[PDB]
Write a protein that binds this ligand. Structure first.
Ligand SMILES: CCCCC/C=C/C/C=C/C/C=C/C/C=C/CCCC(=O)O[C@@H](COC(=O)CCCCCCCCCCCCCCCCC)COP(=O)(O)O[C@@H]1[C@H](O)[C@H](O)[C@@H](O)[C@H](O)[C@@H]1O
Ligand SMILES: CCCCCCCC/C=C/CCCCCCCC(=O)OC[C@H](COP(=O)(O)OCCN)OC(=O)CCCCCCC/C=C/CCCCCCCC
Ligand SMILES: CC(C)CCC[C@@H](C)[C@@H]1CC[C@H]2[C@@H]3CC=C4C[C@@H](O)CC[C@]4(C)[C@H]3CC[C@@]21C
Ligand SMILES: CC(C)CCC[C@@H](C)[C@H]1CC[C@H]2[C@@H]3CC=C4C[C@@H](O)CC[C@]4(C)[C@H]3CC[C@]12C
Ligand SMILES: CC(C)CCC[C@@H](C)[C@H]1CC[C@H]2[C@@H]3CC=C4C[C@@H](O)CC[C@]4(C)[C@H]3CC[C@]12C
Ligand SMILES: CC(C)CCC[C@@H](C)[C@H]1CC[C@H]2[C@@H]3CC=C4C[C@@H](O)CC[C@]4(C)[C@H]3CC[C@]12C
Ligand SMILES: CC(C)CCC[C@@H](C)[C@H]1CC[C@H]2[C@@H]3CC=C4C[C@@H](O)CC[C@]4(C)[C@H]3CC[C@]12C
Ligand SMILES: CC(C)CCC[C@@H](C)[C@H]1CC[C@H]2[C@@H]3CC=C4C[C@@H](O)CC[C@]4(C)[C@H]3CC[C@]12C
Ligand SMILES: CC(C)CCC[C@@H](C)[C@H]1CC[C@H]2[C@@H]3CC=C4C[C@@H](O)CC[C@]4(C)[C@H]3CC[C@]12C
Ligand SMILES: CC(C)CCC[C@@H](C)[C@H]1CC[C@H]2[C@@H]3CC=C4C[C@@H](O)CC[C@]4(C)[C@H]3CC[C@]12C
Ligand SMILES: CC(C)CCC[C@@H](C)[C@H]1CC[C@H]2[C@@H]3CC=C4C[C@@H](O)CC[C@]4(C)[C@H]3CC[C@]12C
Ligand SMILES: CC(C)CCC[C@@H](C)[C@H]1CC[C@H]2[C@@H]3CC=C4C[C@@H](O)CC[C@]4(C)[C@H]3CC[C@]12C
Ligand SMILES: CC(C)CCC[C@@H](C)[C@H]1CC[C@H]2[C@@H]3CC=C4C[C@@H](O)CC[C@]4(C)[C@H]3CC[C@]12C
Ligand SMILES: CC(C)CCC[C@@H](C)[C@H]1CC[C@H]2[C@@H]3CC=C4C[C@@H](O)CC[C@]4(C)[C@H]3CC[C@]12C
Ligand SMILES: CC(C)CCC[C@@H](C)[C@H]1CC[C@H]2[C@@H]3CC=C4C[C@@H](O)CC[C@]4(C)[C@H]3CC[C@]12C
Ligand SMILES: CC(C)CCC[C@@H](C)[C@H]1CC[C@H]2[C@@H]3CC=C4C[C@@H](O)CC[C@]4(C)[C@H]3CC[C@]12C
Ligand SMILES: CC(C)CCC[C@@H](C)[C@H]1CC[C@H]2[C@@H]3CC=C4C[C@@H](O)CC[C@]4(C)[C@H]3CC[C@]12C
Ligand SMILES: CC(C)CCC[C@@H](C)[C@H]1CC[C@H]2[C@@H]3CC=C4C[C@@H](O)CC[C@]4(C)[C@H]3CC[C@]12C
Ligand SMILES: CC(C)CCC[C@@H](C)[C@H]1CC[C@H]2[C@H]3CC=C4C[C@@H](O)CC[C@]4(C)[C@H]3CC[C@]12C
Ligand SMILES: CC(C)CCC[C@@H](C)[C@H]1CC[C@H]2[C@H]3CC=C4C[C@@H](O)CC[C@]4(C)[C@H]3CC[C@]12C
Lengths: 540, 541
C-alpha cells in the first residue's frame, strides 16, 4: 500500500515526477505555477523530530529553540518601554544575523515583531542583508518558491516557531527556511522520511517469497523517487541477489523506473543459465531399454516356476527334487532387485533394501547349490562303505536354515546400527564430483561392503573344493557338471565387479551405475538359472 | 601502569578517596582550607572528545556557542558604541538568564563584560536571581572544580566550561558556564572514556584472564572505579568474573570488596567449585586391589592346571575325554579372565576395544567345544545302534570348531575396522554419565552391536540345551556328559541375567560397582565351568 501511494501521487502532481527522477529537471525547463505545497509529507502521519535525516534538522530545531528563547526571556522584564528607537531596532538584527552564521545549510530567516509590521529578513547563509517590509515549534510541508517559474531550490521546509506576549499572545512568528537539497533522501526503507518503510518497486511483493533472503535493499532499496541529492550512500539499484531459486537478480528485463519480474536463472544450482549445469540430464532412451528388459526376464522367471510344477512327474526333475529346484528359482528374483531399487532415486529406505536383496538372494541361490553339491560327494563316498540313505529337502533345507540364520542375524544388526547415526550423520545418501563440475546423488559405502564381499568369496571356495571331489563320480544327468560351471563363473565375475564398484565409486555417474548393475546380474544370475533349468526339459 | 596510577594518587589527594567510594562522606566532612583542586585525568586524554557522559556535555556547549556567535555580531556593528545604558544592560541580563534556563544540567553561569567589571552571577537551575558585583580561543576547558568555603559541601565537582570574546584587541573577558556532573556516570571504568578508560581496574584483567581463558571479569562493569558522582542504573557488577572452569574461577574466596586479590580457586578437571570430590567418584583402592589379588590368583591356578593335565596324559579318565580337546577349554577359560584386568585399568581407546576381542574369542572356545563334544557322543550313540561307528577325537571335532572361529574372526575384524573409522566423526566409545548425584565418571558406551552379540550366545546355547535333552540314557562310564549338562544351563541363565542387568542399569552404575559385577559374573559361570570339567578327572576315577 505504501509503494502504490507514491505511484498515485506521481500523477496527482503533474511535471514533478520528472523532478523527482532527475534532480536537475528545472535546469532544462521552467514554466509553471508555484507548485509543490505538499506531496506525501509524513507517510506515518508526520515526524515531530524523529527519522534523523542527518543532524542538520535536529541542530536547526535546537538553535531555533534557544534563539526564540531569547525573545521569550525579554518578555516579563519590568519597565520595558521598547520605544523601537534607532539603537533598539539594531538589537533585533543581531539575532537574525546570528541565526545564519552557525549552521551548515540554512536559507532566509525573518521576524515579524508586530509591535506597524517592523518585519526584518535576511538572505541565504554567508550572504545576507537587512530589509524592512511595510505553538511549540510547529512544522511545514516541503515547499517550493512561488515567485515565477520553478527555479532550483529543492523543496525547502519552513520550520517556524511562535512568540507569546504578556500584558495573551503576540501575533508574531519566527521563520527559518532550512535548505534540504544536499540531504540524503531517506533510504526507501527502515522507516524515516518521505520513503516510508516500503516505498519502492517491489522489494517483497515479487522477489522475496520464492527467493529466500532477497536482500533487495543492500543500502538503498529499489532506489526510489529521490530528487534531493545523490550522497555517498551509493543507491543500490537491483541489489536483490538471493543466491539461486526461481528469482535471481533481475538482469533480464524490467529495469530503470519500471522494475518488476526479476524471476529467472533457476535450475538446481546457484548459477544463472539454462539447464546446462549440475543435475545432469538422465537419459530416458537408455533407462527404458533396461528396466523394461529387467522386468521381461523377471516375469519369464516366475512363469518358469509354474512349468516345473506341471512337469514335476518327469524323470529329470524327480532326481533333483521339486523343493530344491524352486528354492534356487525363487531366490533369483531377489537377485533381480539390484536394478529396480537403484533405478528410481537414492533414498534412506531405498538404500537399506539394496543390501537386503543381495545378501538374502545369494544365501538362497548359491547357499543351496553347494549343499546339493556336497550331498553328491557324501552319498557316493559313504555308500561305497554302504548304508546311510540320504534324503531330499528336510535334511538339505534343514542345513540351509542355519545359513539363512547367520545372514538374517547380520542384516538385523546392521540395519539397527545404521538407522541410529541418522540423528548425527546420514551416510546412506552422498554426492559425487565429475570432471565437468557435476554432482549426482548416490549411496555411500560404509566399510561393511568390503567385508560382505569377502564372505561371498570365502563361501564360494567351499564349493570349489567340492567340485574336485565329485570330479570322478558317475552321474545319470551330468547335473554335478553344470553345478560346477555355475560356481566357477559366479566366483570370477563377482570379484571383478566388486573391485570396479569399490575403486570407481565416485567417478561413476548415476546413469553409469545401472549399466554395471545390468551387466553383472545378466552374466552371473541369468547363466545360473540357464544352466540349472535348461538341461532338465530337453537335451536329457 | 594505568591501574596503579589511581592508588598512587590516592595518597596524593587524601581525604578525598573516602569521598570517591562513598559519595555521602561529604556531610560529616567538616573542615579543610578548601577541597579538590585537580585530578590527573590526562591518561586517556586531555578531556574526552566525543565523551560518553550523555549528550548533556555535547548539548550544553551548543547553548554557549550560539550565544557567543550572537555576541559575535555587534563587535563590528556600526554606531554600536553607546554608554552602557539601563536598556543595554537588561539585554545582557536576558542573555545570561537564557543560558541558565537552556539546560537543567548547567549551574551558575557568568559573563564578564569588562567595559567597570559588570560581572553577573546567578543562582542554580530553576531558581536563579541576578546579582551585580564590583591570545587563545575556541572554547578552552577546565578541570573539575570543588567549591572552597569551609569543607567540601554537597555539589562537589563542577566543570567550568569557558570561552573568549574577541571585540573590535579581544575583550579581556570570558564566558563562564558551570556544569554539574552529579547525575553523570563515569563511563564504564573499562571502555575508553572518562577517568578510568580501559584502566584503573586493579586486581583484575591479567590477574584472571590468561590462565583463566575467557575470564569475563567485566560482565557489565569491570572494577567500579571512582563513583563519588552517582550510582546510575549501570549496576556496577563488582567481582563479576566467572571465567567458566579456569585456574582462577570466579574469585569468591578471599580479598573481597575494595582491596581485591586471590581470585584463583575451584579448578580440577571439572567446571565445578569446591574440592576435588564433586567430580571425582570414590575409588576404594583397598577394595580395587582386593579383587585383582584374587582374580589374578585364579589365572595362575588355571595355567598350572594345564601342566598338571599334561603330566597326567596317560590317565584312564583323560584318555577317554581327549587331551587335545581338554587343553583348548583351559586356554579359552584363561582368555575369559581378561574382562576385569582390562576394566580395572582406566577406560582407554585401545583397551576398551580389546574388551570385546577377549570375550568373543573366549566364548566360542569354551562354549564352542563343549557343545561339539556333547554332539559327538550323541552321533556315536545313534550310529552304534545299527552298524558302522563314525566320529573320532580331536581332528574331526577339533577342525569343526574352525568354522565357528573363522566366523567369529570375520565379525571381529568387520566390527573393529568399522569402529575405528567413525573416530574422525565421533569417538562413540569413551562416554560418561552421572550416578544420580552430579558426580560423573568416565566409562565406555554401548555400540548397539553389543545388544546383538548377546542373543547370539543365547541362541547358540539353545543347541547345547537340546543336545543335553537328547542324551539322557546313554551308558556313560565316567559320567562325562552329565557334568557338561549343568555347565551349559548355568551359564545360559547367569550370563543372560548379567547382560540384562548391565544393559538396563548401564549409565547409573559407578565404576567400582561395575568391577563388582564383572568380577561376580566371571566367577559364577567361568570358574564353575572349569570346576566341573576338570575336578572329576583326577579324583573319582
Ligand atoms: C559374534 C559372532 C556371531 C556370528 C554369527 C552369529 C549367529 C547368530 C545365531 C547362531 C545360531 C546357531 C545355530 C547352530 C546350528 C548348528 C546345528 O544345529 O547343526 C545342524 C546342521 O548344521 C550344518 O551342518 C550346516 C552346515 C554349516 C554351514 C554354516 C556356515 C555359516 C556361514 C554363514 C553364511 C555366509 C553367507 C555367505 C554369503 C552372504 C545339525 O545338523 P545334524 O544333522 O544334527 O548334523 C549334521 C552336521 O551338523 C554335522 O555337524 C555332522 O557331520 C553330522 O551330524 C551331520 O548330519
Ligand atoms: C556370540 C559368540 C557366540 C559364537 C557363535 C558363533 C556361531 C557362528 C557359526 C554358527 C554355526 C555354523 C555351523 C557350525 C555347526 C557345525 C559345523 C560343521 O560341522 O560344518 C562343517 C561342514 C561339513 O560338515 P560334515 O560333518 O563333514 O558334513 C556332514 C553333512 N551331513 O563344512 C562346512 O560347513 C565348512 C564351512 C565353510 C563355509 C564357508 C565359510 C567362510 C567364512 C564365511 C564367514 C561369514 C560369516 C557370516 C557373515 C554373513 C555376512 C552376510
Ligand atoms: C520367512 C521366515 C521368517 C520363516 C522361515 C521358517 C521356515 C519356513 C523355514 C524356511 C524354509 C523351511 C523348510 C521349507 C520346506 C520344507 C519341506 C517340508 O516337506 C518340510 C518342512 C521344510 C523342511 C521347511 C522347514 C522350515 C524351514 C527350514
Ligand atoms: C528369501 C528367504 C528369506 C526365504 C526363502 C523362501 C523359500 C524357502 C520358499 C518361498 C516359496 C516356497 C515354495 C512355495 C511353493 C511350493 C510348492 C510346494 O508344492 C512345494 C514347496 C514349494 C516349492 C515352496 C518351497 C520353499 C519356497 C521356495
Ligand atoms: C526383500 C525382503 C525379504 C525384505 C524384508 C523387509 C525389510 C527390507 C524391511 C522390514 C522392516 C523394514 C525397516 C522398518 C523401519 C525402518 C526405519 C526407517 O526410518 C528406515 C527404513 C527401515 C530401516 C526399514 C527398512 C526395510 C525393512 C528392514
Ligand atoms: C530363517 C530363520 C529365521 C529360521 C530358523 C529356524 C529353523 C532353523 C528351525 C525352526 C523349526 C526347526 C525344526 C523344528 C523341529 C525339528 C524336528 C527335530 O528333528 C529337530 C530338528 C527340526 C527339523 C528343527 C530344525 C530347525 C528348524 C527348521
Ligand atoms: C522379515 C522381517 C519381518 C523381519 C525383520 C525384522 C527387523 C529387520 C526389524 C524388527 C524391529 C525393527 C526395529 C524396530 C524399531 C527401530 C527404532 C527406529 O528408530 C530405528 C529402526 C529400528 C531399530 C528397527 C530396525 C529393524 C527391526 C530390527
Ligand atoms: C578379491 C575379492 C575377494 C574382492 C575383495 C575386495 C577388495 C579387493 C576391495 C575392497 C575394498 C577395496 C579398496 C577400497 C578403496 C581403495 C582406495 C583407492 O584409492 C584405491 C583402491 C582401494 C585400496 C580398494 C582396493 C580394492 C579393495 C581392497
Ligand atoms: C583368510 C584366511 C585366514 C583363510 C584362508 C582359508 C579360508 C579362506 C577358508 C574359507 C573356506 C575354506 C575352504 C572351505 C572348504 C574346504 C573343505 C575341506 O574339504 C578342505 C578345506 C577347504 C577347501 C577350505 C580351505 C580354505 C578356505 C577357503
Ligand atoms: C561370455 C561369458 C563371459 C559369459 C558367461 C558364460 C559362461 C560362464 C558359460 C556360458 C556357456 C558355458 C559353456 C556351455 C557348455 C559347455 C560344455 C561342457 O562340456 C563344458 C563347459 C562348457 C564349455 C560351458 C562353460 C561355461 C560357459 C562358457
Ligand atoms: C543373456 C546373457 C546374460 C547370456 C546368457 C546365455 C545363456 C542363457 C546361454 C548361453 C549358452 C547356453 C548353453 C549352450 C549349450 C548348452 C548345451 C545344451 O545341453 C543346452 C544347455 C547349455 C549348457 C546352454 C545353457 C544356456 C546358455 C549358458
Ligand atoms: C585361536 C585361539 C583364540 C584359540 C586356539 C588355541 C588352541 C587351538 C591351542 C592353543 C594351545 C594348544 C595346545 C598346546 C600344546 C599341546 C600339547 C600337545 O602335546 C598336544 C596339543 C596341545 C594340547 C595343544 C592343543 C591346541 C591348543 C589348545
Ligand atoms: C593360531 C591361531 C592364531 C589361528 C587359528 C587357529 C586354528 C586356525 C588352528 C589351531 C589348531 C588347529 C588344528 C590343530 C590340529 C588339527 C588336526 C587335524 O584335523 C588337522 C587340522 C587340525 C584340526 C587343525 C585345524 C586348524 C586349527 C583349528
Ligand atoms: C578373512 C576375514 C575374516 C576378514 C579379512 C579382512 C582383512 C584380511 C582385510 C580384507 C579387506 C581389508 C580392508 C579393505 C579396505 C580398507 C580401507 C582402508 O582405508 C583401510 C583398511 C581397510 C579397512 C582394510 C582392512 C583389512 C581388511 C578388512
Ligand atoms: C587376526 C588378524 C588377522 C587381525 C588383525 C587386525 C587388523 C588387520 C585391523 C584391526 C584394526 C584395524 C585398524 C582400525 C582403524 C584404522 C584407522 C583407519 O583410518 C585406517 C585403518 C586402521 C589403521 C585399521 C587397519 C587394520 C587393523 C589394524
Ligand atoms: C538358580 C540357577 C543358578 C539354577 C541352576 C540350574 C541347576 C540347578 C540345574 C539346571 C540344569 C540342571 C541339570 C539338567 C539335566 C540333568 C540330567 C539329569 O539326568 C540329572 C540332573 C541334571 C544334571 C540337572 C541338574 C540340575 C541343573 C544343573
Ligand atoms: C536374554 C538375552 C536376550 C540377554 C540380552 C538382552 C537383550 C536382548 C535385551 C532384552 C531386554 C532389553 C532391554 C529392555 C528395555 C530397555 C530400556 C530402554 O530404555 C533401553 C534399552 C533396554 C535396557 C533394553 C536393552 C536390550 C535388552 C537387555
Ligand atoms: C568360588 C565361588 C564362585 C563358588 C564356586 C566354586 C566351585 C568351583 C565349586 C562349588 C561346588 C563344587 C562342586 C561340588 C561337588 C562336586 C562333586 C564331585 O564329585 C566333583 C566336583 C564337584 C562337581 C564340585 C566342583 C567345584 C564346584 C563347582
Ligand atoms: C570370466 C571369464 C574368464 C569367463 C568365464 C569362464 C570360466 C568361468 C569357465 C569357462 C570354461 C569353464 C570350465 C573349464 C573346465 C572345467 C572342467 C570340466 O570338467 C567341468 C567344468 C569346469 C570346472 C569349468 C570351470 C569354469 C570355466 C573355466
Ligand atoms: C581364522 C582361522 C580359522 C584361519 C585358519 C585357516 C585354515 C587353517 C582353516 C580356516 C578354516 C578351516 C576349515 C575350512 C573348511 C573345512 C571343512 C570343515 O567341514 C572341516 C574343517 C575344514 C577342513 C577346515 C580346514 C582348515 C581351515 C581352512
Amino acid at each position: 500500500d505504501g509503494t502504490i501511494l507514491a505511484q498515485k501521487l506521481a500523477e496527482e502532481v503533474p511535471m514533478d515526477v520528472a523532478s523527482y527522477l532527475y534532480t536537475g529537471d528545472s535546469h532544462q525547463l521552467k514554466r509553471a505555477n508555484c507548485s509543490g505545497r505538499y506531496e506525501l509529507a509524513g507517510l506515518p502521519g508526520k515526524w515531530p523530530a524523529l527519522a534523523s535525516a542527518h543532524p542538520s534538522l535536529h541542530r536547526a530545531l535546537d538553535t531555533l529553540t534557544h534563539a526564540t528563547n531569547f525573545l521569550n526571556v525579554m518578555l516579563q522584564s519590568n519597565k520595558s518601554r521598547e520605544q523601537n528607537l534607532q539603537d533598539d531596532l539594531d538589537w533585533y538584527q543581531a539575532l537574525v544575523w546570528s541565526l545564519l552564521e552557525g549552521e551548515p545549510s540554512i536559507s532566509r530567516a525573518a521576524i515579524t515583531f508586530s509591535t506597524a509590521p517592523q518585519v526584518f529578513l535576511q538572505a541565504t547563509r554567508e550572504e545576507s542583508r537587512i530589509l524592512l517590509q511595510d505553538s511549540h515549534f510547529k512544522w511545514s510541508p516541503p515547499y517550493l518558491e512561488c515567485e515565477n517559474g520553478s527555479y532550483k531550490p529543492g523543496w525547502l521546509v519552513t520550520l517556524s516557531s511562535a512568540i507569546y506576549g504578556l500584558q495573551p499572545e503576540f501575533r508574531g512568528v519566527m521563520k527559518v527556511d532550512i535548505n534540504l537539497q544536499k540531504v540524503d533522501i531517506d533510504q526507501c526503507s527502515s522507516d524515516g522520511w518521505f520513503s516510508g518503510t516500503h516505498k519502492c518497486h517491489l522489494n517483497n511483493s515479487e522477489c522475496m517469497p520464492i527467493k529466500g533472503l532477497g536482500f533487495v535493499l543492500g543500502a538503498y532499496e529499489c532506489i526510489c523517487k529521490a530528487g534531493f541529492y545523490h550522497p555517498g550512500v551509493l543507491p543500490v539499484n537491483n541489489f536483490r541477489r538471493r543466491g539461486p531459486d526461481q528469482h535471481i537478480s533481475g538482469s533480464t528485463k524490467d529495469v530503470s523506473e519500471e522494475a518488476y519480474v526479476c524471476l529467472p536463472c533457476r535450475e538446481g544450482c546457484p548459477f544463472c543459465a539454462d539447464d546446462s549445469p549440475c543435475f545432469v540430464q538422465e537419459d530416458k532412451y537408455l533407462r527404458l531399454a533396461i528396466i523394461s528388459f529387467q522386468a521381461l526376464c523377471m516375469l519369464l522367471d516366475f512363469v518358469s516356476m509354474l512349468v516345473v510344477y506341471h512337469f514335476r512327474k518327469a524323470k529329470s526333475i524327480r532326481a533333483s527334487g521339486l523343493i530344491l529346484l524352486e528354492t534356487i528359482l525363487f531366490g533369483s528374483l531377489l537377485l533381480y532387485f539390484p536394478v529396480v531399487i537403484l533405478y528410481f532415486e537414492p533414498s534412506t529406505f531405498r538404500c537399506i533394501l539394496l543390501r537386503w536383496a543381495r545378501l538374502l538372494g545369494f544365501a538362497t541361490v548359491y547357499g543351496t547349490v553347494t549343499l546339493k553339491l556336497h550331498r553328491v560327494l557324501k552319498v557316493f563316498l559313504s555308500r561305497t562303505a554302504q548304508r546311510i540313505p540320504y534324503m531330499t529337502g528336510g535334511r538339505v533345507m534343514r542345513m540351509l536354515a542355519v545359513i539363512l540364520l547367520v545372514v538374517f542375524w547380520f542384516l538385523i544388526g546392521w540395519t539397527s546400527s545404521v538407522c541410529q547415526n541418522l540423528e548425527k550423520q546420514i551416510s546412506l545418501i552422498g554426492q559425487g564430483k565429475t570432471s565437468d563440475h557435476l554432482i549426482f546423488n548416490m549411496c555411500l559405502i560404509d566399510r561393511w561392503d568390503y567385508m560382505t564381499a569377502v564372505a561371498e568369496f570365502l563361501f564360494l571356495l567351499w564349493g570349489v573344493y567340492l567340485c574336485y571331489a565329485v570330479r570322478t563320480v558317475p552321474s545319470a544327468f551330468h547335473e554335478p557338471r553344470y553345478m560346477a560351471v555355475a560356481v566357477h563363473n559366479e566366483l570370477i565375475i563377482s570379484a571383478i565387479f566388486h573391485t570396479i564398484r569399490f575403486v570407481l565409486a565416485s567417478r561413476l555417474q548415476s546413469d553409469w551405475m545401472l549399466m554395471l548393475y545390468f551387466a553383472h546380474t545378466h552374466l552371473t544370475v541369468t547363466v545360473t538359472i540357464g544352466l540349472l533349468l535348461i538341461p532338465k526339459f530337453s537335451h536329457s
